[PDB]
Design a protein around this ligand. Structure first.
Ligand code: HSH
Ligand code: HSG
Ligand code: HSG
Ligand code: HSH
Ligand code: HSG
Ligand code: HSG
Ligand code: HSH
Ligand code: HSG
Ligand code: HSG
Ligand code: HSH
Ligand code: HSG
Ligand code: HSG
Lengths: 231, 231, 231, 231
């Protein structure tokens, strides 16, 4: 219903994503002896979409991601008219979460967002595993396209009803289980932007890559489903 | 149906929560080499709500948490009349689980609830990660509000039916994956009270914080859903 | 339909349980550096019930456990007539899995079922954590009763349809996340018997405890649901 | 509908499987300190089927596995006519994923697919745990048969509708939690072939075992369900 409801849902769900997924990375993943690892961060990322696509999916469509919104537009499933408002709402909801995360994070002696990366996406020298830019393009392109094909299929008219938030949220856990070592896993321009702002340095300088590549990837995934798989 | 059924359900489900989530913390999380970590405790917390909201959710609403009950009241989804009886039922069911957990725990040489914290919530000197009180307020406030927005949305008239226990239980796993390092993760006054009693010391002295903050947080989350997202 | 179908389902699902849950313990849990821990064994246990209660639940009821069968009888949900045939079917399906597991396990240099315990349940000197017999009784009694209350509730006429295998399977993961350190987690006489036979020693000598306690526990859980929660 | 849609779905979902499950093994499982282990690889494997059986299951049946396709044929659930086209589609979709994975993997200094095994299945000297060929046959035979019985049951006319992708995907996680130490877990000829090609050596020499055994196993599982459990 009336756009305000949908934009609020998109801003709150993207907030959830960044605060949830990035907070687990910043606060819990490398905690001595008991911390949750990349597996726990990956679970946390997927649970934000699972939980918010259940909570507000009926309201806005449950995108929480500029590449989902744009890929859904290329899949002939979303109107170009509401695209820009969704992306701004996602970025704003994302940023507000990184700021609050940054304040929570600063309450521990020795915190340093620039030096730790603040869960930012990067490649080459700023890839966790030491992976080249090409490794990073290929992975984010395949994983963004795949994510969009799952989103498109699971929300298809003929797919089983009500299960979509499970498929989509879990796809995002999968995607994280594969690619954290390569790019810290983006597949989401709004989530990359939100943390890059607070990292302040290299993250802002590679940010472009995490707009171009997930968006291009989400377009391809949406065109693959629309042209090859749907009717 | 008739209040006795609902209060029994609330007492049993909160019992499940404390015994399940706190028992995994006390007995299994730091077990040498094979223990389950914060990730396993977080899974365990979420599974108590998932499993009991399926089992007794049809009976009482499946709250298991004084902040859920109060936030559901502020969301215009629950009557102020049954609020007090739910909270007492939750606290009583919680306490009975900590006592039984404490007796199970005492059957191993060297157990010491005061010195180990008995999975109690704290801040500052009693935060697992060494996080300030402000870090603790912000996290429990955002995570309580978010939890309440998921609860409100997933149980909305227009949300897919029957899936709510999955969304809500998993939200609680998420919430734990983020915040154990900060406050040992409360979001639940009854769960905090239950373990604080048996820790006996500092936990009882910071207990107030874990009534005020999760309740205030759950109120905001419920008012955000009711005023900004629902109709 | 005609008893043969149901007994086959019970024998195959209990086979799945033992081979799945116990195999993960015997083969994968303590594997150097990459092994799955108690958290992975707990996930594996729950996934056997989740997966078989989906596969054959429509056929037999999906019990896979003599304490479930007996507790379902005490809950006024299962006829005393088919009780004995279910329990024998469970034990037989369990034993066949431990034998096949034992043969798979023997294909690695240095395997020794008596000395490793072969994932057997025990207490006192044969508890993983060094827990007393009383610690073991209390935990298996509370966890068996709780399991039975989840089973009873999730399969209640008024509970959401089709979700029961998720609630029940996950409850069993929970139960394992809490109690592996205490008794290696039984809640299942047939699963205890199956591995005890191949351990050959102390496991057979404490086996009685894992018939009495889970059964008594499952009775209480079923009577709690029938008398306090159902109508 | 018209075969092209189904073959595309099978090729894309098997691509997802290999890239998802094998990529997590190659890129993330042994990552220093934070890596995901066998538990995370097992989760990743199951999530590919869960996510694609939701996305394209309505299109092709959601097989993603030559042993599923053939076992579904032996279960009297799939026509022999479309069997060959499915298997070729699976192998092709698998191979394209291993090539892209191999290129992503090569972007890190010191990568070596022959020397690391490239997540390939093997036995004896090429089993992760040092397990004999007999250990490997028994495990892949029981786990393939079991997988096929879950697939058959969960997609039975009388099983709860829409839940099948959850049961099946999770069964595959289970299967991986048990058997990675034994054979690196195949249960899938197409997934074995895809990585064996890029490993280049011993993997190609034992590849036959991972066609014969999962197929034979999937046949038995399908005949067990059709003859003993279905009508
Ligand atoms: C919806 C608003 C966000 C738009 C995406 C911003 C992309 C950031 O681009 C960065 O800015 C360049 C020039 O100022 C940097 O030098 C460059 O490295 C790029 O990442
Ligand atoms: C919607 C918010 C997007 C903000 C992205 C703007 C890009 C910023 O560019 C970087 O700004 C400097 C920060 O002071 C960096 O030091 C520069 O290297 C520059 O790339
Ligand atoms: C929302 C789209 C983000 C802006 C897209 C930038 C594409 C231009 O290509 C690259 O951009 C530069 C950043 O200013 C890089 O430094 C260049 O190497 C160029 O390849
Ligand atoms: C539903 C009953 C539980 C009510 C909440 C109890 C709050 C506990 O407050 C504690 O008691 C103070 C004074 O006795 C302590 O000194 C203080 O630190 C506070 O945490
Ligand atoms: C429903 C049960 C709530 C119980 C909470 C009461 C608060 C207790 O206050 C603390 O009691 C002493 C225990 O003997 C502590 O030592 C004190 O510091 C005091 O804060
Ligand atoms: C159910 C509500 C619990 C009681 C709320 C107490 C609020 C009062 O604020 C703080 O309470 C004291 C505990 O007695 C603290 O020690 C004080 O610092 C005060 O800030
Ligand atoms: C459905 C058949 C399984 C029945 C349960 C068998 C219980 C095993 O009892 C054990 O046998 C005693 C005497 O032979 C042992 O000494 C005793 O320790 C007990 O555990
Ligand atoms: C349905 C199978 C149940 C089998 C349980 C029988 C109990 C066995 O008792 C033990 O048998 C000896 C094995 O040779 C042990 O050494 C004894 O200590 C005895 O307790
Ligand atoms: C299916 C029920 C299993 C048999 C129940 C045995 C109950 C008897 O109590 C205990 O049994 C002995 C085993 O033979 C113990 O060794 C005794 O200590 C006794 O407490
Ligand atoms: C759908 C096409 C894939 C068919 C399965 C190929 C099986 C590979 O067999 C391997 O080839 C032998 C002879 O060339 C090897 O020496 C042998 O070890 C075998 O694994
Ligand atoms: C559809 C693709 C299936 C490809 C499997 C063919 C088997 C290859 O056999 C192996 O080929 C050599 C690679 O150059 C190995 O060195 C040989 O040992 C041989 O077994
Ligand atoms: C699609 C089926 C794959 C081919 C089946 C081969 C079965 C033959 O048995 C074994 O095959 C040889 C591989 O060429 C082995 O090396 C032999 O030991 C033989 O046992």
């Amino acid at each position: 219903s009336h756009m305000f409801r949908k934009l609020a849902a998109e801003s709150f769900g993207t907030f959830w994503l960044v605060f949830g997924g990035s907070g687990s990375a910043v606060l819990a993943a490398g905690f001595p002896e008991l911390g949750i690892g990349f597996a726990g961060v990956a679970l946390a990322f997927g649970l934000t979409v699972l939980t918010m696509a259940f909570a507000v999916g009926h309201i806005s469509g449950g995108h929480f991601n500029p590449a989902v919104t744009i890929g859904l537009w290329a899949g002939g499933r979303f109107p170009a008219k509401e695209v820009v408002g969704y992306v701004i709402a996602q970025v704003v909801g994302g940023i507000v979460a990184a700021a609050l995360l940054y304040l929570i994070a600063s309450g521990k002696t020795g915190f340093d967002a620039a030096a730790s990366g603040f869960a930012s996406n990067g490649y080459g020298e700023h890839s966790p595993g030491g992976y080249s830019m090409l490794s990073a393009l290929v992975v984010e392109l395949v994983l963004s396209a795949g994510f969009l094909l799952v989103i498109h299929g699971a929300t298809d008219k003929f797919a089983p009803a009500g299960f979509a938030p499970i498929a989509i949220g879990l796809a995002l856990t999968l995607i994280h289980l594969i690619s954290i070592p390569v790019t810290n896993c983006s597949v989401n321009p709004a989530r990359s932007t939100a943390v890059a702002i607070f990292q302040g340095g290299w993250a802002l300088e590679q940010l472009w890559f995490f707009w171009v590549v997930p968006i291009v990837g989400g377009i391809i995934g949406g065109l693959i489903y629309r042209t090859l798989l749907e009717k």
